[PDB]
C-alpha cells in the first residue's frame, strides 16, 4: 500500500544513520529516531518477508559487539577501549548475531563471485577467526553461570560449534566441573586469547567486507577515501 512507500523511506533514513566509514555506534541523540524506525519496520506487514539489506546486519554486528576501529594507519575519531562487558552475552541474542554475521559472509561471497583475491582471502580467514571468537566467548559465558544451563549450552554447541569431539567432549567435561574450577579455566583461556584480539579481527573483517562490497559491487559504505589510499 502506502505502507510500502513508507517502509522504503524509513529504510532509506536508517541507511543514512547506519552506514558509517568507521563502525556504527548509537549516540543518545539518534536513539529515539533509530528506535522509531526499527519499530516501524518491525511492525510493517509489507516488510514481513522482505530481505534484510546487508547494511543493517553490518550495523547490528557493529552495535552488538561494540566494535571499535583497529588501524591503514589513518585518521582517528575519539573512541574508547575494548570491553566484553558492553557486550550482552546471551544465548538467543548471540545466536541471532551469528546468523547475521553469516548473512554478511554470504553476501560477501555472492559479490566476489561476480588485488581482489587477497581481499577475498583475508576476509575468509578473518571471518573464520571472528565466528570462532564469538562462539568461544559465548561458551565462556555459559561456563560462568551457576548453575549451568545445560540445554541451551548444548543446543548452542550444536548449532555453531565447529567443535568436533576433541572439543565439546572436553567442553562437556569442563562444564560439569564445580563452579570455582570452571571460573579458573575460563579465566585462563580468557587471558590466553583476550577479547581485544577478537574485537580487532571482527572490526577488520567488517571493514574489509565493506571495502570489498563498495569496490566490486554498487554498495556504498563510505570507504572511498580508503580505496587507493
Amino acid at each position: 500500500s502506502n505502507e510500502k512507500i513508507r517502509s522504503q523511506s524509513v529504510l532509506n533514513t536508517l541507511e543514512t544513520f547506519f552506514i558509517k566509514e568507521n563502525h556504527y555506534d548509537m549516540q543518545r541523540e539518534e536513539s529515539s529516531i533509530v528506535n522509531a524506525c526499527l519499530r516501524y519496520l518491525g511492525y510493517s506487514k509489507s516488510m514481513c518477508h522482505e530481505k534484510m539489506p546487508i547494511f543493517m546486519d553490518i550495523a547490528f554486528i557493529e552495535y552488538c559487539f561494540n566494535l571499535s576501529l583497529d588501524p591503514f594507519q589513518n585518521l582517528p575519531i575519539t573512541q574508547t577501549q575494548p570491553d566484553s562487558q558492553q557486550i550482552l552475552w546471551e544465548y538467543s541474542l548471540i545466536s541471532n548475531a551469528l546468523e547475521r554475521l553469516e548473512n554478511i559472509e554470504l553476501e560477501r561471497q555472492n559479490c566476489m563471485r561476480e588485488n581482489k583475491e587477497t581481499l577475498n582471502n583475508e576476509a575468509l580467514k578473518l571471518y573464520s577467526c571472528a565466528k570462532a571468537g564469538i562462539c568461544r566467548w559465548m561458551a565462556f559465558h555459559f561456563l560462568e553461570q551457576e548453575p549451568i544451563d545445560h540445554i541451551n549450552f548444548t543446543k548452542f554447541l550444536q548449532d555453531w560449534g565447529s567443535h568436533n569431539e576433541k572439543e565439546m567432549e572436553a567442553l562437556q567435561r569442563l562444564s560439569k566441573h564445580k563452579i570455582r574450577k570452571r571460573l579458573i579455566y575460563v579465566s585462563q583461556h580468557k587471558k590466553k586469547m583476550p577479547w581485544s584480539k577478537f574485537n580487532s579481527v571482527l572490526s577488520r573483517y567488517i571493514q574489509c567486507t565493506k571495502l570489498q562490497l563498495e569496490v566490486f559491487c554498487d554498495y556504498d559504505f563510505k570507504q572511498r577515501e580508503i580505496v587507493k589510499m
Binding site: 580467514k125 573464520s128 577467526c129 570462532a132 568461544r136 565447529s162 586469547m193
Partner: peptide, 6 residues
C-alpha cells in the same frame, strides 16, 4: 585449542 593466525 582454537583456529589462530597472525
Amino acid at each position: 585449542g582454537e583456529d589462530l593466525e597472525i
